[PDB]
Amino acid sequence: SRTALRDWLTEQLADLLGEPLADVRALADDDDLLGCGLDSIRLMYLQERLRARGSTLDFAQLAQRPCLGAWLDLLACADRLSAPATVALPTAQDRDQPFELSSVQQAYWLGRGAGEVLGNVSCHAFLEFRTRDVDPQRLAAAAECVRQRHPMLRARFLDGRQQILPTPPLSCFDLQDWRTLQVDEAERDWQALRDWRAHECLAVERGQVFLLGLVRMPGGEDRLWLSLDLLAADVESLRLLLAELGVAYLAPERLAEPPALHFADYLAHRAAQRAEAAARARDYWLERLPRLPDAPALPLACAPESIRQPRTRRLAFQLSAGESRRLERLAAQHGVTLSSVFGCAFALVLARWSESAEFLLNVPLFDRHADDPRIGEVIADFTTLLLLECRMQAGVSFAEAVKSFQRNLHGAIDHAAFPALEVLREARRQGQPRSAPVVFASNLGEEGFVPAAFRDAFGDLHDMLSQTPQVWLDHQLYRVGDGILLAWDSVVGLFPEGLPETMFEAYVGLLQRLCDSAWGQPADLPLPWAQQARRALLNGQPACATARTLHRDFFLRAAEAPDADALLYRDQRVTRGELAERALRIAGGLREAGVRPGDAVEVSLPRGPQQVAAVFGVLAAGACYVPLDIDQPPARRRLIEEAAGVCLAITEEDDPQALPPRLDVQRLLRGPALAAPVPLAPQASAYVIYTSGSTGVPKGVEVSHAAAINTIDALLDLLRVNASDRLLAVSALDFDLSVFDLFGGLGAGASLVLPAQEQARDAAAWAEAIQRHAVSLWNSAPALLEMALSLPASQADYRSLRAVLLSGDWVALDLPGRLRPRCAEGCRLHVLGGATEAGIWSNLQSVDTVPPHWRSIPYGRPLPGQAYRVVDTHGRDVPDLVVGELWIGGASLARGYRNDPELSARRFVHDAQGRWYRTGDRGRYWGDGTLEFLGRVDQQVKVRGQRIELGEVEAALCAQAGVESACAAVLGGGVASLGAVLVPRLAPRAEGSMDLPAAQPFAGLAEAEAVLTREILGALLEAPLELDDGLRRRWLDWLADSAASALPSLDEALRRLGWQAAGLTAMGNALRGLLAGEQAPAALLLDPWLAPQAVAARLPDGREALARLLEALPTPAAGERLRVAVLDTRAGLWLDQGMASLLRPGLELTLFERSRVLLDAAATRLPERIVVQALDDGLLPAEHLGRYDRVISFAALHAYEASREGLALAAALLRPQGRLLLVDLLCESPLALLGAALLDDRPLRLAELPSLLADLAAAGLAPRCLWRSERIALVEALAPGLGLDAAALQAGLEQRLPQAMRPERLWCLPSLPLNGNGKVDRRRLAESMTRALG
Amino acid sequence: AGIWSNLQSVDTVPPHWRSIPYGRPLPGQAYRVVDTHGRDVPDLVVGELWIGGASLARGYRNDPELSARRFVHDAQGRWYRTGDRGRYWGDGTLEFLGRVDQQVKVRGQRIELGEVEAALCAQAGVESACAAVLGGGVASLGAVLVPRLAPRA
Amino acid sequence: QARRALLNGQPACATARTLHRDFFLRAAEAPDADALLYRDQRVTRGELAERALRIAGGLREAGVRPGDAVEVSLPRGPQQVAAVFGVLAAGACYVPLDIDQPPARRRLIEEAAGVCLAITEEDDPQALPPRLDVQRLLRGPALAAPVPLAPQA
């Protein structure tokens, strides 16, 4: 009955909560029992009592709706829908034999290993207690009594299994009577002792799991300490131990009984009990293993694998009794367990400090669940490790957050049946390196951590330390007094030396806040105010900006000193006055040409004075200059123009009929000079520097005069630029560093050294110019200065160079090391940060020297007038040392993108902090407020220091005719080349028409192959130990099923196949050597007598099919050069059989295969007139696209993961109107079965030729089947005009990309490899390309 | 906010001060001037003063609700939400501008007029009450009573 | 925004510590040093510290424990300072009230506060909160040192 059931639940809740039966009964159906002080420890005990009862329920079920009514309902349903749990336990495990480890036990054991990741540690608790005076003899007696009483306390650990000794051979009590020492000496020795034994590797191997100890300090103080290996004892077990100790010290007579429930018995019973749940959980985890989050992405000073001896540091916060009370109350009001509160908080802090909000944390569960109540007296390691997946939502109230967290945890508690350890093991087995190095241990049962029994004899817990291995951060909670002890047992040196402290302080602040505030408050933690303050300081630096039009200063200068040198060129030099007059003439021409304030103007000129004048006149006319390198291709030019909405294009070409009106700059120089520059508001658009754009359409960064001038001022005031200075305009016009060159330098009065167009990348020229003109200021991407510096000092003199700006690409740490001896005394290297979209720059690290701790030259302080924010994916500012998205803000931001409002909105985001560019740069603040830039998560990459979005190069390839999809990457090596990958489009069509002259094959060939299989199976099975057990079983079954009892026949088999007794002897000897030498499976393909395609080339009359496939190469009849390619070369074995006839006059042969070594063997055995190219990592060079009139595949198309793969590869490799030649296996070859079994590959790859031709037509080819049908189907198909060609590709990339971002090396794939997420595997591709390089 | 959250040093009073302003925030703490909506107000703009930083109280002792109400959060962190009116100057100085609400000063000590009103409403025979600080040199606190008449037949 | 960020971002002078730390440090350094000055009498750092510690020990004897709210309702003087330093020293949180504070409002505060204890000139364990005589507390055993408090407390 429901009511009776309610009564029973009342009874259990009374028992568990320690409340009156009546009172409990009073609790409403709808009353939240976590509201009534229930916790997960109690509720797992209730779940166990319901399971004993037979009313089996999932803790998830109970704890998702933790109210009487819900449970009642559930139980009502369960009683008829749920099975009982009356599992018959094993009667007993021998109580003295080595028995199996618990999962958690296993984990802790594995950690002891020196070679284990962050291991080499005990997993022991060290406890510390303070008491005035206690008898050492009583303590020793109590320690030995507890060891004898509790089997587990004397448990030896070996070979991944645990054995309980009668009496351990090693000491149990460590007495250090230091009453004779000085107070200072005693304290120092104690400190040493603490720092030793708190981290001690307990001799578990000798039963030393438990080691009590005492120090008698001379100041009349006895410091009880307890080194307990949690291998042995759960921390609830530790407190039990505490209790036991206290009783044995005060009165061992009152020790009730040694618990009879032997731990091995417990383990066996528990295992048997959980088997079902275990399997369920395993299925759960397996369904979620690929989607598990990684470990918390916390800042790590030192790699955990790099820590040989991890020292633990506790961060302790004793939550007051009132605080505890408040937490409890609030948790109750919000319908959550206090442990979920703490855990939620912990998770939040992690997330905030974690690059990823989603992470794993090891939640040790209380898992004491057995039939015998006496189990709550046992001292064993009753823990079970929960692999808690936590996905902290940002922006939600802590109420929401906590609720979510609880739900997750409660759901996972059931799933914990399948241990965390095994989850992780499967992750490694599945290639997932994921782990849970962050522990959350909520030991929150209100009896107090330190039992009364213990408290009476000795003082409450003074200090403690965990040593959990493989654990970064062992978070624990203890009932200290009536309060809560917040413990962060972090690893010394693992984290930044100041990190853990900070993070713990934030944790404590959040908890306290919870205490004193409603949970409707945001879960998003505030930054540690120190951090925020620092960053505010960095961000708030006043703008140096004398808010003005970007051209103002230059013109000012020119009026002040028109005769002053402004520009320096190949030989000529241009004064301020001349440059200003030319710019004003250009501006007058533009206004005559219809240009007007703020109207976008394209500037496509070779580098030189006219370029400068054009830009200046653009600005002067009130317009916004859209710089484009003359090198800019027509197509991308058009794209830019269109996107830009460019009113006009200044060029060396007069073409009003162009897309935009295109004017000759020289004709504009003939125009009437304006009296003065058009009055522009500083806020007006200055330039539209076209960044590369991820969709393929180039993106225009519309930077205001205000913004550019802000940056320039910020840097001018710092560089102290003056008239005497001279810059070098190495920076392209369409690279915004030139904005500082032009405007900055000229406004300051500094002269500009202008490399010629031909000098755009000429380091020698640069050097010469520098030397000649005494250049005092340099400004570039570091890629250009590295190039410069490549020149010897003698060949290149930089000693005039007063200061250096390097920016917009990674400045290598040794580059200041090269530069200081080269440049002027007082070197003044500045490294500057921030994207095109923040004016020019947004940071400055001065580099008077590189300190050792820089992993890269950081972004320094933000420049004056602008700022940085490092943010989570959610937009919330990340703490210090925390990797997040760099957010540039301030006066220096671009107005947006030119004609991309959407993207502008996306990127130039808003906040209560203002406007922010949202760079997609990764980076982190440091504790000193420096800002480490950390590269990029995305497709924006640096090539030759220039900015390229790989999605642009990919889209410029996909624009190409015959391209389906493409991938681009920056490759390794010194070159640091861009490269890319192609996915052809094959134009699928209906070419399934087929005719088949199947008159040649006969069943005698099948019988003959069966006989040869019999011979080889007998040859190897006479020495069967060379195979493995599975291969032995398979070969034994085959000896009949494919050789003897299926198709028995005569020895005529050999005379039909071709290979005679000598060939069979060679095959057998090679097979025996292959298996004995451990060279399988690779060396099988190196043998002509054993490779499946090689044997298929002779056995099923494969040589005749090879001869016919060798026909239709018309080079001798054509009397002209022909190019032929092979996709299934491998070791060139069948080719070794047919090469002499294959090499027809004028025939050019190339060999392909997805292996370097096999093709090396093929080249070794085949003559020199044959080209060999490896599909390195399955990667096809683009050079071979559409280059071959004929393509050949031989008895290996099935070996490809899909016939579509090889068919697409051949179609791409075929010159238009070229013909594929293909022989493939439709029916299994019994000897090829042995070959595949040596390869251990499935014979299911094969299919009949109708499917082959269907796929081939789906590949766009038009097939014709020649002969031999079922055994060897000789198919030849024509390839249509895919349009793919190296030449063609090149042309297209020339048409659509500047030479700075064309792939220098180009590749091809039938299909892109995919990441676990289903996205393009760009890493893999990158790697592939890199390897392909050489 | 701990004890204090600003410091104006006063070596001399420049004529432009209509009141001695809150100066700079004290080290380790901060001020925000916000709209009713929580967004920061520009300079010279009258808004709610938001104190923040290391100096904030943990909250109210046993008033989580009120704590939440007052000690509000933002992307800028934790803020007390004083109900002081005030404005930032162009120089960064923070003119405090008194209060819109019932929190008022008597003998320099802090009184909420809603307390004095509720302490009168607690009185037998009181329906509703109003309190205010009065004019004159005394700057006295006074209050007004609304009797409850026990209506009957 | 920049200006205000500057204002707000001033680094914390805070040597993050328990509020009582410094005084005890001083006391240890110079116990003889004059700490308080009263009507006629003067109290040394040492004396004050001792008194505070005695108070603290009495508090902990009275069941007081870290972070637990303690009412301090004493006439202004050395005893009142001693009382709050001991409250702090005990690990507790002092809830100061004027002796002038009326019974009703006192009760209100006490209730609201969840005050563990009330330091007074009056011994009345039967009060709403356990009410202790400061003088009696002064007779309590002095603590070796202040209870170690986390600054966040």
Ligand SMILES: [N][C]([C][S])C(=O)O=P([O])([O])O[C][C]1O[C](N2[C]=NC3=C2N=[C]N=C3[N])[C]([O])[C]1[O]
């Ligand atoms: N010029 C430049 C600016 S500076 C440009 O425009 O380009 P970009 O792309 O934007 O830039 C570059 C990239 O990356 C980053 N950065 C800057 N700076 C730098 C870098 N990296 C490294 N290092 C350095 N320094 C940005 O942000 C972008 O993204």
Ligand SMILES: [Mg+2]
């Ligand atoms: Mg960029």
